[PDB]
């Protein structure tokens, strides 16, 4: 009585791992009450065709837009800027919709503040290349041109 698992399950559980439990626990509780299944060999592939068509399939299906920054490897046209101030230095900040303004016509248009650098955002030269939230892994690269008027 080996059986493979469905839900978690205390001292063995793991949503699909290969256990070997006492027959009773199974034909008396685990199965007929949905939680496991006889390891009927028919099954050890039926529930291994997933461990491959998933943990090696849908974990690769993620990789189709590398870095997401594809042909944007040469920065983007500077429509406007991101502001300035302090007669030479910097003074103004980025409203909850003001890092786009410059790169405001490139990719798809949005407007949200998934802030990444919890600092007072350094006030100097201008053009900088950090990262921003493009996804739970990758990054992106562009610059920032000010406006003289």
């Amino acid at each position: 009585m080996q059986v493979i698992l469905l839900d978690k399950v205390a001292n063995l559980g793991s949503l699909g791992d290969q256990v070997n439990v006492k027959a009773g626990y199974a034909r008396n509780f685990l199965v007929p009450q949905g939680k496991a299944v006889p390891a009927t060999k028919k099954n050890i592939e039926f529930f291994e065709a997933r461990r491959a068509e998933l943990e090696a399939k849908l974990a690769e299906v993620l990789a189709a837009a590398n870095a997401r920054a594809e042909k944007i490897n040469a920065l983007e046209t500077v429509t406007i800027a991101s502001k300035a101030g302090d007669e030479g230095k910097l003074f103004g900040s980025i409203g909850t919709r003001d890092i786009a303004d410059a790169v405001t016509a490139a990719g798809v248009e949005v407007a949200k503040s998934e802030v990444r650098l919890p600092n007072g955002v350094l006030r100097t030269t201008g053009e900088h290349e950090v990262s921003f939230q493009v996804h739970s892994e990758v990054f992106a690269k562009v610059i920032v041109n000010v406006v003289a008027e």
């Binding site: 009585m1 027959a23 199974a26 034909r27 007929p32 009450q33 006889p38 009927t40």
Partner: protein
């Protein structure tokens, strides 16, 4: 009828044989148990009078298949 619904197992006859080697007619008879099985395929407890082994069989072949027999054999369940 001490008879295992899934394996056919009924009682058999034999001798006892002492040290003296004395034959005495006797019976071996199955370890039966009549257990309440869950089906899910039928949302119900079909409750067969099985012999362990009979049990071990269900535990392998599966109940829908064991109940598949019987149905196909005549038996009630």
């Amino acid at each position: 009828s001490r008879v295992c619904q899934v394996t056919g197992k009924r009682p058999v006859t034999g001798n006892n044989r002492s040290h003296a080697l004395n034959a005495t007619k006797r019976r071996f008879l199955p370890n039966l148990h009549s257990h309440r099985f869950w089906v899910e395929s039928e949302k119900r407890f079909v409750t067969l009078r099985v012999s362990a082994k009979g049990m071990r069989v269900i535990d392998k072949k599966g109940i829908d298949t064991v109940l598949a027999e019987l149905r196909a054999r005549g038996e009630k369940y």
